[PDB]
Symmetry: D3
Subunit: 140 residues, 6 copies
């Protein structure tokens, strides 16, 4: 009914600069609850199936090394229609078309090293959280 | 010329959670002045003519009891074309289509228990303030 | 047990500049609840018994006219030992000795036209709220 | 490649009220760097070629006197496609169509005394900075 | 030299209300880096050795059940003399003597259900992080 | 009477990280006005008489090169007893004794590369502004 769970991630640029506080705020003050917050670098074992559909791209190697550069923060949120709300409130991956008020539209400049990744659909969200978060990791 | 006066209200959810500070801020820092700020629960004598046009709705009783649950904050603002500016800066009552940067688009999740009510037109504003604020209550 | 109620007021400088949002915030985010929020100019009928103990001062007339200049906001808060917490979090009336982080220590410059008035003791608070807020005005 | 430089200015209303901090913030936290920040009133020698294309307007004299009223802040920013990003993040000069989240859409009320001026194109930016900032004034 | 690591925790009140964003901010904007951020409820296996020195207290059972009520956030920070800086910037556990500007002095009201726990000494910090964070959990 | 003018500067760390917005805010929202805001790197011609009294120190060369590393922002403020208010609101140069709520007590970690420099006395302020700001640079 209202137990839909999404996933939000922080790129190495976000942490090397340091913005996680407001990133958490934009969901916390909204009303969405968090069930899982894990910190890691994820190595390369998980940054192959996460972008498995993007493996046939020229930028796959460079971008995956860019993500692998440093540690990355992982969050899981739940709320009514949360998946759609997150993507629009995050903003388009291309800063050129990114209205003010969205996280990616307020801290991201270039398409290359973007800041935030989020699930487009419920199936993607559940698959990703299964890949990353063990069932005991989450809470209620 | 520039004496147009509007009305903004706070639902019981807004106060039971507590957000009135930023709600006031979004108008105060804008430049609009306030002429009236009264706090009450309004009983049921005023929550019948306020939604008199919505009396023929299945959700009228439940929603009016939800509003009657706790006390509600009432504000009056004035400014150039303030009525139109308030509604757009507040955001659509449906969070599904609510761009970031609007009060209802930054703290409201579900259509049922919305947060903010505002006058759609000048006539509605004047009728409501007559229903709620006595002429001596306001200031200049 | 925890029903102690205090009083906080806004000088005409605070509103003519406009700072009520953060003033409300500093108590709202703290956890204190509000039972009464009334807006008025208070005329001169209430600005004689409020400072009745200060009537024998050279600055009484000038300061009371300064307060009477414009409308003033009145608030009532409740919380555990709220009266003591409010005064320290407000800061000393003299900005010269006013540590950062207090409302009067972050927006007030000169002793003359100070910004915030608050009850020093429970008896003063109850007397003032009786003078200003009628029993039906407050809520629970 | 990424050395494109723009220009942002502060109207006398912005400083007489005082908002330069958040105005700087909206670009600083974004990632854009600043190469030049000069404070002056600019007299009337520069407020004739800045609006030379607007000289044939009925409001030219009144608006130029309004700008000449007080001192004005001048800033220069650089970033990828910064010129386009600044104008959209600033918001339309007409507050009537100004979505929330933009500087002009969050602090400006009337078209007459607007708050922020910015370069529409690279050529305008370079011409203006040549008119205002001497080459030694800027930094790298 | 500068690798000293501390520990900060969030009580169930902090999350059930929701304040983790600003709590993270107060350290992130300061300059301290984080090496570990894990979310759990910790059961009762870890809330016996954490307060082993407080086992001989009348409030031990009630307080440990209060902490066990909900999930709790765990953070680890590193910086020059970070342990001392954290405790003073957090504020005294007793709100009665808690100057404004400290996290516990800006969101905590009563001694009973306090908000933040932090290591008093380096030895306590290392013992606690050994109890909670596995060596592979942390990063560099 | 109230025309006392002080000086505040931004170290290269402050700009290379980027914090000038809040630094300006802490004075702007207070009420102090600014008469001069110039941006430069100042070369070494001015970073010899500024610290002429500190020339007989072992850290003079290293610290002066650290300041010379990048450009530095210069500001001038005026207000009632502004010089004393600035220094206390800035906080002690040593972060070890720096209460929360002060700029240096909220963003500085180590004594070596401090963030903010300010005039201790009126004579120092006037001498410094004479060294840096030409009389025509300032405004009224």
């Amino acid at each position: 009914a209202n137990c839909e769970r999404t996933f939000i991630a922080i790129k190495p640029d976000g942490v090397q600069r340091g913005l996680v506080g407001e990133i958490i705020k934009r969901f916390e003050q909204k009303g969405f609850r968090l069930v899982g917050l894990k910190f890691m670098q994820a190595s390369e074992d998980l940054l192959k199936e996460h972008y498995v559909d993007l493996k046939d791209r020229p930028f796959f190697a460079g971008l995956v090394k860019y993500m692998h550069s440093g540690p990355v923060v992982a969050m899981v949120w739940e709320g009514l229609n949360v998946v759609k709300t997150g993507r629009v409130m995050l903003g388009e991956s291309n800063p050129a078309d990114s209205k003010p008020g969205t996280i990616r539209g307020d801290f991201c400049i270039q398409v290359g090293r973007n800041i935030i990744h989020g699930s487009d659909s419920v199936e993607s969200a559940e698959k990703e959280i299964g890949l990353w978060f063990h069932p005991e990791e989450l809470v209620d």
